[PDB]
Design a protein around this ligand. Structure first.
Ligand SMILES: N[C@](CC1c2ccccc2Oc2ccccc21)(C(=O)O)[C@H]1C[C@@H]1C(=O)O
Ligand SMILES: N[C@](CC1c2ccccc2Oc2ccccc21)(C(=O)O)[C@H]1C[C@@H]1C(=O)O
Lengths: 770, 770
């Protein structure tokens, strides 16, 4: 209870003593902060251009790290609303703070009474909502803003799969929850595990915690939000359990820049990312400390306790009279707190709020106005969250709509080297991230920056199926096969005319194979074909020169001409059916087939007709010319109408071959000549064969006549069986893979065999010598 | 501020005066309740076996329907924690209530200090959660328990589609929200509309509200939760807008049992469901009122104001000395409040809590114990919610875990009749619903109970598709067609052999139609068939008797026998192919077909063979017997192997007919005799025909011989064309719907025509007279 005059009175709650009130002068926490508050008030009342003639007053009470004691004191604040009675004060703002769950309770009791309250040290995420704390402002970063630093650094280093660790308190739980929530929304990071310790661990607990963190050897980032016991005991109990070089630690101030947690556990904590609230050094207030005497500070009720506990003398034991002694040399090691700047900033913000309210409510009139006499709570709260000023550090102090303060942290890193063991500054976090990546050193099992990704980007051509529920993880599967590889998750089929590339991705044309001119199957047919076209040509040459000569007289008639033409055409098609297929070749092959088949058989039938039926015009010229021209014209028109013969149209078997291995699958350059087309084409040939067979069965009972007409029948009979053998060897070739090879060989050889039989008893031995 | 002695002191907040404090003695609200509290305390201190020698004290303060004034008074409660100074009191419980937002604020300031608070009149749903009101108990039903009555009655009457109405306040909004929430979870009810009025309506607002409630003429239940202005103005502004007999009203106490809202708007509110908190009548406290003098009630600070405002005399104007006058006769119309029972119940509950705590904390020792000297807040709160007692009504008072009280309401109904205009009691709601349905009267446009269902259950066979998002609504679609009707939403196809029932649901066998024996298409073939079997039989009779007779000598040989047999068989199959199909009939038809076709044609060929080729064994017996027996045995084995002839197997065309109308669709009893089977069956007949044609073309150049052999050829030629005509009229019948009819007629008539041609020049005119 400190009474300082004033015209606008404020209040102050401070943690003098410790956890009704136990006796331990908390010193740094309490006394320092009281002196800071009174100091800042003292320079507020001197600045001529801050609040004009208005003066400030102060009502400083005590809290002993208890919630209820602070409740009684906050009741003491509000007592002007309830014979030498003195006028009570009128508090227009409360400026006090401590560990949380104290600011919470005073915030409730003060929001019930529309009194603003600005805190300097209370940093609890639960105190970050307008509901239930509409009147609570804060001039220090929330601890939830610390969880935005770990997320940013984890994203910056590329880690997406981490393991969180915490302690059972209101600190660890809230910090881990904020880390999880920021990890959500903005994605890119995943949490493998979340292990929370108890307040008191049973024997072996740390071993189980370590081994369950060691269960998944892919998450090697441990974001610890937990007090010193976890640090010390996890880093020491991992020595003989051998997780060294397997976990990288990122911790909050609970670890901080301290060296006490690990006295020698340095090889288990060879790397760390530590976040600390920024710090300053107030010069005028240190002077205030240095100028405080005993005859001056009668303003402090509990200041003799400071004299007794800061030097060890019980004035009321060294029993020293204590004379007069400045508190630097005769005092023990001296240092101030880091939170004095915030308790100065709070009172400055409140004074600025009052000044800004004066600017509007009471214009021009120096001092006060009756309108301004009552300091309305709502207007003051509105003006408090409207200040953008800077003081006592050179750094700005401002509040968002919630009333919190922007967070300014710094980041330290821990490594070792010969003679070097320190906490280098790798950067900071003031509404953004600033990391000196090249400054970081992880020189224990990781030469470059370490890795914690759940899965690793694969080679192209291996479809990566993201496992459901965890984008940070996936599993790669080969997409080899006829299907092409399009995207990371997309690989669909490429067209059958595109063999999939041997590069495990891409597609290319299938090679096309064709019956080759030089092959171990076509050489013997072309050879026998040319052998035939030599001997047959020789005989034809013999006949024509000697048409009138006896014995060859029957040969002189054009019947022999037509038979020879048919034989030569058969041989020609035998040769041509071998060479490489082309756009129009096969149509020519078909026309030649029709032509030769008509010629030879028509000659055979007309000769048989002339020979036999005449036993009951007969002359060779008349009969032959008519029938030959007629039948040739018939087949000529049959060819002309392009029903059996195909157009230049062809087929390429790019993908018709169904080989499981694309590589060895091939194709053929096949004219689209159907087997039914072949059968119907030779149908007229079959009819001629049937007619000639009937005629020669009639001849079988041959009249005496001559002897040259029986070989005609015999040769035709042999050719009948020779050609009938073809049909089974036409149908049976479809089963084999080399359908084209066997089909072409059998057709060509069967034609050559029929031709050679016609070259037999028909006209060879009759002219052995002519 | 009232001071009453005591050893355990309680507190009381009451609404004396009205909305710093304006001067209007609120009377019924304040004074009555103060007297009730002091009365209940007076009988608490007399009961020998309630709290033993412990005595109670009282601290009664005032609230003037303001939140802040109550805040100051609640500060006054807690002042024992902060030279003739007197010892302040120690309140161990607060017993006070008012309209809400006052109990809320005192509950906050008291939960900060672990002081129990039991309310008697504060009924706000927001005060129904352990969070922020852990120390607030209630001895009156929440208004949220009223929203459980409307839901129950709406479910009981069958309504599932209603329209909610509200007023812009903390009453209407919360009530409608609770109604919606209870409408969810347990389903069965839907809300068509939710219209909320403003605090001040612009001109025409009510017209727009009425017309938007009138937009959907299917929801005719209006659950109003709104104060009197809505009642009066909506019921009066609907007169000329003609929504009478279109909305049924269910309202809360804001309407209540009052008659002031509608002075004459009775035909727009001819029916109502009103919910009211239950009521009692305290007898001892009315006596307390009657026994209060002026020289006694010095215990009340504000009691002269009651004397002045309850009679009109300013003692300090009738300026009457006021003598001594009891407050019944010389006083104006006297009546008490309904909430006195609750303020008695609160103090009784607190005293019982203290007694129960004494039972455990201090055993056996009468008076007090040092352990029991401090009345811990947590233990007292635990014991408060452990009481199951009854008093001051005969009804029980108890608290759930939340601290609320069970709700006991009654339900009134408003109707009119000649000379009757009242609020009958249709039942109540005490943790359940009790409705006298037969007591309700809606005798204005609804003789029976009215209806508000969004959709109406349809007839079976009409699939009801529930509209998504609203189970209470659906749309019925006919499911006529071959698909059967299974369930309300399920109607799938029934088997093709089951015509869907004409009952719009069900399936039944399709009638099967067959070629009938008496038909306008089969009569002429069967008639010509029997005509043939008469004349042919007559000729056969003639031949056999006269085999040796000349002219008939050629007929004597069994060649004529075989021809006659063939003709008779043809006629027989002509007859049989008409009658109804059966299991095995068609196989017999096929065998007879083969037999007759073989017989007739074989005879024709063998006769032709005997006649012609012999110009270059010849005797009738030898030749005929061999060939006839051989060919008949051939066809006999052909039949025996059941390849062409089908087994007893048959087909029924239950659903093969594809008629869009199932009703007229039919089926046929068809043997599975394929057309290819017919063609291949007659193939041997075709071969015989071809052979005979060749033979008779050879005969055409007939030798002189005789003249009976040329009709053989001529008749065969005619039969050739007659039978060849059948094939086009065999193939062309498939297009027509009556495929069976035309096919059977053409086959049978073609057979009869061929038979009649064989009955022509073969053997008829050669025996004109024998
Ligand atoms: N920021 C503090 C302390 C903060 C903390 C906050 C909430 C709960 C636990 C908790 O424990 C730790 C442990 C290590 C580092 C910081 C904290 C606050 O209580 O708000 C504030 C008391 C500190 C001060 O007054 O100097
Ligand atoms: N039940 C009351 C009143 C209830 C209500 C509750 C909440 C908000 C508004 C509100 O206004 C209406 C209007 C008409 C009927 C009942 C209420 C409570 O305040 O809880 C309480 C005042 C009653 C009393 O003190 O006798």
């Amino acid at each position: 209870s400190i009474r300082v005059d004033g015209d606008i009175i404020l209040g102050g709650l401070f943690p003098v003593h410790a956890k009704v009130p136990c006796g331990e002068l908390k010193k740094e926490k309490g006394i320092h902060r009281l002196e800071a508050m009174l100091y800042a008030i003292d320079q507020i009342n001197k600045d001529p251009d801050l609040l004009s003639n208005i003066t400030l007053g102060v009502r400083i009470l005590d809290t002993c790290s208890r919630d209820t004691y602070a409740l009684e004191q906050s009741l003491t604040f509000v007592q002007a609303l309830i014979p030498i009675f003195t006028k009570p004060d009128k508090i227009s703002g409360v400026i006090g703070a401590a560990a949380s769950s104290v600011s919470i309770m005073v915030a409730n009791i003060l929001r019930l009474f529309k009194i603003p309250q600005i805190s300097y040290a209370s940093t609890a995420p639960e105190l970050s909502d307008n509901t239930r704390y509409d009147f609570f402002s804060r001039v220090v970063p929330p601890d939830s803003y610390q969880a935005q630093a770990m997320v940013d650094i984890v994203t910056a280093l590329g880690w997406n799969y981490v393991s969180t660790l915490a302690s059972e308190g209101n600190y660890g739980e809230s910090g881990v929850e904020a880390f999880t929530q920021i990890s959500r929304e903005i994605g890119g990071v995943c949490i493998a595990q979340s292990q929370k310790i108890p307040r008191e661990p049973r024997p072996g607990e740390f071993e189980k915690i370590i081994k369950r963190l060691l269960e998944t050897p892919n998450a090697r980032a441990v974001i610890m939000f937990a007090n010193e016991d976890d640090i010390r005991r996890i880093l020491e109990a991992a020595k003989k359990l051998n997780q060294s070089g397997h976990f990288l630690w990122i911790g909050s101030d609970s670890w901080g820049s301290k060296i006490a947690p690990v006295y020698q556990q340095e090889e288990i904590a060879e790397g760390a990312v530590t976040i600390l609230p920024k710090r300053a050094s107030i010069d005028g207030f240190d002077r205030y400390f240095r100028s405080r005497t005993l005859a001056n500070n009668r303003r402090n009720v509990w200041f003799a306790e400071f004299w007794e506990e800061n030097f060890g003398c019980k004035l009321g034991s060294h029993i020293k009279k204590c004379t007069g002694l400045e508190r630097i040399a005769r005092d023990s090691s001296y240092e101030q707190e880091g939170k004095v700047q915030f308790v100065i900033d709070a009172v400055y913000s409140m004074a600025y709020a009052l000044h800004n309210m004066h600017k509007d409510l009471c214009p021009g009139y120096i001092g006060l106005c009756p309108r301004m006499s009552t300091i309305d709570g709502k207007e003051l709260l509105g003006y408090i969250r409207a200040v953008n000023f800077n003081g006592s550090a050179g750094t700005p102090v401002t509040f968002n709509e919630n009333g919190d303060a922007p967070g300014r942290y710094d980041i330290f890193q821990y490594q070792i080297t010969n003679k070097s063991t320190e906490y280098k500054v790798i950067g900071h976090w003031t509404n953004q991230l600033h990391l000196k990546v090249e400054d970081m050193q992880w020189a224990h099992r990781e030469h470059t920056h370490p890795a914690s990704v759940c899965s690793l980007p694969c080679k192209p051509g291996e479809r990566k199926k993201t496992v459901k529920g965890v984008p940070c993880c996936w599993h790669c599967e080969r997409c080899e096969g006829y299907n092409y590889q399009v995207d990371e998750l997309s690989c669909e089929l490429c067209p059958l005319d595109q063999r999939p590339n041997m590069n495990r991705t891409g597609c290319q044309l299938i090679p096309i194979i064709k019956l080759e001119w030089h092959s171990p199957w076509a050489v013997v047919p072309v050879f026998v074909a040319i052998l035939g076209i030599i001997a047959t040509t020789f005989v034809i040459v013999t006949f024509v020169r000697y048409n009138d000569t006896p014995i060859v007289r029957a040969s002189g008639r054009e019947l022999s001409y037509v038979l020879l033409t048919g034989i030569f055409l058969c041989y020609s098609i035998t040769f041509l059916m071998i060479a490489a297929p082309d756009t129009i070749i096969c149509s020519f092959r078909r026309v030649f087939l029709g032509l030769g088949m008509c010629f030879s058989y028509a000659a055979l039938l007309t000769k048989t007709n002339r020979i036999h039926r005449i036993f009951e015009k007969f002359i060779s010229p008349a009969s032959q010319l008519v029938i030959t021209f007629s039948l040739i014209s018939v087949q000529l028109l049959g060819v002309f109408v392009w029903f059996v013969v195909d157009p230049p149209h062809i087929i390429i078997d790019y993908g018709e071959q169904r080989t499981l291995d694309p590589e060895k699958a091939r194709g053929v350059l096949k004219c689209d000549i159907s087997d039914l087309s072949l059968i119907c084409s030779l149908g007229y040939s079959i009819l001629l064969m049937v007619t000639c067979t009937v005629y020669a069965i009639k001849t079988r009972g041959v009249p005496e006549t001559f002897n040259e007409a029986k070989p005609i029948g015999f040769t035709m009979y042999t050719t009948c069986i020779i050609w009938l053998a073809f049909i089974p060897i036409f149908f049976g070739t479809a089963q084999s893979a080399e359908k084209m090879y066997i089909q072409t060989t059998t057709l060509t050889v069967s034609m050559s065999l029929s031709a050679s039989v016609s070259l037999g008893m028909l006209y060879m031995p009759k002219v052995y010598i002519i």
